[PDB]
């Protein structure tokens with residue numbers, strides 16, 4: 031329980047990105063009313079207070095909120111930061127509107143078990159006209175993978191299990207998306223963006239989407255999986271823009287990467303433009319069409 | 330879901346120990362009626378069938394049981410192995426008694442989220458007079474740990490989190506037992522057994538227990554945690570006895586080791602006989618007294 035919060039705090043890419051955004055753009059926070067959606071320990075609320083926020087409201091539905099109360103007091107910030115326990119759609123705030131919303135809401139593959147729905151609710155109910163939401167821009171990308179040894183470990187493995195056939199288990203493991211840090215040497219295409227979200231204009235219905243994609247193959251090889259990741263941007267009104275990626279060419283984060291195993295690996299050639307389609311539906315499911323096969327995956 | 334079953338199958342120490350016990354002691358199974366409690370994919374049932382079982386009954390409450398049905402058919406064992414979906418305390422078996430019970434029921438620190446309760450129920454309701462249950466003997470042990478760097482990572486960490494005090498979080502993380510493979514070089518005492526279970530005579534009430542223990546300190550150092558693990562024995566009527574340990578001096582298993590962090594590390598000296606007390610209560614909790622401090626931990 032508390033160990034999870036510890037893990038997110040120790041994710042430097044995640045936490046230092048938010049810290050850098052806030053501290054390097056204090057003009058965004060100076061004398062502003064800030065709402066921190068799903069505040070956890072309160073760390074983002076304290077960053078905002080340090081950057082000069084007039085008032086910060088930290089909301090969380092979990093028992094961690096009681097720790098946050100004690101944390102805020104230990105740091106002598108109780109006159110700036112007010113904490114409220116509950117869902118953002120149910121709680122009563124002591125203001126009508128806020129100037130800025132900040133939140134670390136992101137799930138695996140951006141949208142699995144994410145709090146984006148609550149952030150958008152907060153944006154629609156509470157954001158002042160001309161206010162801002164951060165991080166403001168997110169993208170999701172796909173990339174092709176060749177890893178014949180790992181595929182054999184997950185799939186061919188079932189053909190002989192201590193002397194017994196277990197082939198039918200292949201059908202059970204294929205639909206399970208995997209969250210894992212990938213060796214960047216196993217990537218065999220350029221990444222392809224499949225989704226762009228601006229939190230200022232995105233609605234809840236935009237989170238169910240379809241995209242035709244094209245993977246520019248960079249290595250002649252057997253394609254055994256498709257991997258997904260996301261990038262997070264702090265852009266609007268920033269003098270110091272901040273970006274981080276959760277892809278395999280970047281420093282690992284707790285989001286790792288998301289892997290969709292192909293039931294039937296197929297050969298590709300460098301220079302090939304590999305076309306497919308992806309759809310994300312509400313727990314989320316991901317439907318992939320590639321090489322004339324379709325499979326739906328879940329996390 | 331299915332990935333978990335895959336992980337348990339790929340745990341060689343676990344799965345090969347059961348395989349070796351059954352295959353190297355086929356006299357235990359020859360022409361016998363066998364009950365496999367929580368059969369998963371059915372692998373233990375198929376081992377027993379291969380060793381010459383007259384009849385095997387595999388029971389599991391999970392959807393994996395449907396995969397097991399298909400697996401048993403792929404291996405042409407349906408005339409020997411019958412699978413039944415449900416809790417052992419609710420299902421109807423096609424026999425009054427069985428000759429042998431086998432089960433992989435073990436949890437972290439032996440007893441967290443274990444199926445031992447169901448195994449003992451099966452033993453009491455269904456085991457023929459003079460029948461046998463395997464594995465038949467289990468022990469739990471404690472060992473002292475020195476790891477000042479890891480302790481600092483978990484505890485002192487909270488004193489300064491990106492410039493802010495979070496000291497109160499120490500109290501939240503201490504009670505959370507950790508499941509992790511330990512570096513055997515960090516062990517600073519001889520192990521001490523705190524519990525011995527023979528499945529033939531153990532009752533459910535025996536699983537809540539207390540033990541005074543003595544740790545024979547082997548290195549002058551700062552003791553920062555107490556670690557727990559368990560050993561599993563296949564003994565009764567065996568010509569080829571089989572043992573495995575889940576301790577840090579042995580090949581890692583999926584059970585890893587269980588770690589109870591000390592809030593206040595304290596110095597110990599080689600040759601010291603360090604005395605403490607441990608009690609396990611029904612989710613399980615573990616109460617430790619050591620160096621005049623008491624703490625209750627959970628998983």
Ligand SMILES: O=C(NCCC1=CCCCC1)Nc1ccc2nnsc2c1
Pocket residue numbers: 175176177178180181184208210254255289291292332333335336339
């Ligand atoms: O499937 C995993 N990891 C899951 C590991 C696991 C091990 C034991 C049971 C539970 C799940 N990774 C993975 C990465 C890149 C790949 N490229 N082509 S196939 C493929 C696979």
Ligand SMILES: O=C(NCCC1=CCCCC1)Nc1ccc2nnsc2c1
Pocket residue numbers: 033034036037040474475476477479480483507509553554588590591
């Ligand atoms: O506490 C862990 N592992 C938990 C790692 C974690 C990291 C980030 C948040 C979630 C939990 N191990 C550990 C082993 C031996 C030890 N000996 N003295 S203290 C101590 C500690």
Ligand SMILES: [Cl-]
Pocket residue numbers: 176178250251252253
């Ligand atoms: Cl290849």
Ligand SMILES: [Cl-]
Pocket residue numbers: 475477549550551552
């Ligand atoms: Cl030391």
